[PDB]
């Protein structure tokens, strides 16, 4: 199933920057083992800005052959130029990939038609289903749920990632699109109640420390247990905050090499968590039993 | 000297969305009869996003070579990417730009410490003249004056386009930076009052269709004539609001077209100005004399 607790994957990198392949090979083993659902790689918690395009086949290809089809792997293949998009997730087609997450364009605002266009574009020139993700805080631009609706009618586009933490907007994607079509929260800290709503899946920054809590999380969320799911939901929320204290994915990094997982790399523009944030962030993490 | 009017070039394209180079040559020569005091070429009014790498240099070098030293050609080498942006700056240099125009980045939401640094690592990196260009409404984030003043200081950093059409910030900028480093407006409809604050100049969409009144609009609000300047800009309003009226640059490219300039290629996602909006347009530019 592409549905369930599906972690936005860090990318690792060594301290000069490079990919470090044994880091990224420990968290793939990490999620397999904590009950992860799906595996998001080279989206926007995986850097996929500061990676060029070669790297983010490289990171796909590595994680599609150690997962050997156990969980579903979905590449991070959006962009603002249509052309760009289709090349990026035909080489992720290519690279074994289950499904493709695809931002919609950020900083050049098409319109709604524009978005359909680019969209129903891709989706009929790649044969991979494709997975629509709306972040208007940081693209500048916001998918309408008529455009989303409009979308869920083209064969091959089968959910979107809705990441504006706005529960009236959830309610009225699900209410639009049909069943088969799966709206996954890209929020944490509401992930629950989107789910309760009749999501199907949190594409979660928090899944990267929490695995186990985040897949228990969802579970309990898709099958209605509102009061467990709110329940550890409750508990993991000092920590939901505390890893957006800084533009993610610069806690996440900061909390997983804290743990052991991975070296303490960043790629320019992005730098390593600012020292004042250190203790809020290490302190939701020994709260929540992470760390 | 880098001041006054500054067309925020177009880039043309036929049907089929390949490069028209006629059509640019076409451009560069209107610009260079009408007074246009410098060009911007592959910024956002370019469409830079959906042009390869090797589209932009193209471009950049094909009007370097038309315009001649004439007047300034300013190259747009932003990128989310502190080695990508160095990569588009360096070319940028060795295809003989002027200065180069660098947005902060769009989408991964540096921190403004993130910002300084991507900036200063370019300006070390690449010896050519650079602008910084503040667009919050198009990259999720923005550079406070603070973070432009301190990038004010760094060698090779020339001034700032500052596209929020805010003027107590364009205040706030202008009073922190020194006198030689230099703030464009960003915002038609505001960039006489910019001026008129001490601003140097405006990197302009509507001097696209209107270069000579742009040129005279620049000119009396840099010498401070402020009832000449407002003059100008009063006639140019609708023209100005029209010109918006779906995502630069859908419309100045349509109003190219309808003054025979500019084919009407225009690259997915974005797509040719919608029929509700040609009326507006066509009457706000019948009504200022473009046509
Ligand atoms: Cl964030
Ligand atoms: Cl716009």
């Given at each position: 199933?592409?549905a369930?607790?599906?972690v936005a994957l860090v ?8 990919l470090?392949?044994?880091?990224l090979?420990k968290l793939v083993?990490?999620?397999l083992?904590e009950g992860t659902?799906?595996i998001?790689?080279?989206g926007?918690?995986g850097e996929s ?6 790297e983010?086949?490289?990171?796909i290809?590595?994680?599609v052959?150690?997962?050997?089809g156990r ?11 249509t052309r760009?998009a289709?090349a ?8 074994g990939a ?6 919609t364009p950020?900083?050049?605002?098409p319109?709604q ?6 969209f ?5 020139a ?5 997975i ?7 693209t500048?631009?916001?998918m309408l749920?008529?455009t989303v609706e409009?979308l869920s009618?083209?064969p091959?586009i ?8 706005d529960?009236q ?9 049909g069943?088969?079509?799966?709206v996954?929260?890209?929020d944490?800290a ?9 999501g ?7 899944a ?10 969802c579970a309990?969320a898709?099958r209605g247990?509102?009061a467990?799911?709110?329940?550890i939901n409750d508990?993991?929320?000092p920590?939901?905050?505390a890893?957006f204290?800084?533009?993610?994915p610069?806690?996440?990094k900061w909390?997983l090499h804290?743990?052991?997982?991975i070296p303490?790399?960043i ?11 250190h203790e809020?962030?290490?302190?939701a ?5 992470v760390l």
């Amino acid at each position: 199933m592409i549905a369930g607790s599906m972690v936005a994957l860090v990318t690792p990198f060594d301290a000069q920057g490079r990919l470090d392949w044994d880091s990224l090979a420990k968290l793939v083993d990490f999620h397999l083992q904590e009950g992860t659902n799906a595996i998001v790689a080279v989206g926007t918690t995986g850097e996929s800005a500061t990676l060029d395009v070669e790297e983010q086949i490289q990171v796909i290809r590595r994680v599609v052959d150690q997962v050997k089809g156990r969980i579903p792997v979905i590449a991070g293949t959006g962009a603002n130029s249509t052309r760009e998009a289709v090349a990026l997730t035909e080489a992720a087609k290519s690279g074994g990939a289950d499904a493709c997450l695809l931002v919609t364009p950020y900083y050049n605002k098409p319109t709604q038609e524009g978005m359909y266009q680019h969209f129903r574009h891709i989706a009929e020139a790649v044969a991979i289903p494709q997975i629509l993700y709306n972040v208007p805080g940081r693209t500048s631009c916001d998918m309408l749920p008529e455009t989303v609706e409009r979308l869920s009618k083209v064969p091959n586009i089968i959910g979107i990632k809705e990441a504006t933490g706005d529960l009236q907007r959830a309610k009225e994607v699900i209410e639009r699109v049909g069943k088969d079509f799966l709206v996954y929260s890209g929020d944490d800290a509401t992930a629950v109640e989107l789910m309760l709503l009749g999501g199907k899946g949190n594409i979660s920054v928090t899944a990267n420390v929490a695995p186990r809590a985040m897949s228990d999380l969802c579970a309990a969320a898709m099958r209605g247990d509102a009061a467990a799911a709110r329940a550890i939901n409750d508990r993991l929320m000092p920590l939901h905050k505390a890893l957006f204290i800084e533009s993610n994915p610069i806690p996440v990094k900061w909390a997983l090499h804290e743990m052991g997982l991975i070296p303490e790399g960043i790629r320019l523009p992005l730098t390593w968590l600012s020292p004042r944030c250190h203790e809020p962030l290490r302190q939701a993490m020994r709260q929540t039993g992470v760390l």
